[PDB]
Amino acid sequence: GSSGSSGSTQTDKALYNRLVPLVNGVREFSEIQLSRLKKLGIHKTDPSTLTEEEVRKFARLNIDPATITWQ
């Protein structure tokens, strides 16, 4: 990715990347993220099927102290 100017409605999207990075040349959740997604009811494995609605949700549950943003 690339950090710079403040894009549009760029809040969850940005995070999504951090959560599911790309090092193996293939974006795929982890036994950790999943176990958490299930609780919500999102039976998805690939980050592609995920939708803004799901993304924002998967991120919401995860709130970092460094970037504490109170909607």
Would you list the DSSP string of the chain? ----S--SS-SHHHHHHHHS--SSSS----HHHHHHHHHHT----STTT--HHHHHHHHHT---STT----
Cα–Cα distance for residue pair 67/28, rounded to 1 Å: 24
Cα–Cα distance for residue pair 35/65, rounded to 1 Å: 22
The count of other CB atoms within 10 Å of the CB of residue 6 is: 5
Q: What technique determined this structure?
A: NMR
**Topology of domain 1-71, CATH:** Helicase, Ruva Protein; domain 3 (1.10.8)
Delimit the domains of the chain by residue range: 1-71
The count of other CB atoms within 10 Å of the CB of residue 1 is: 9
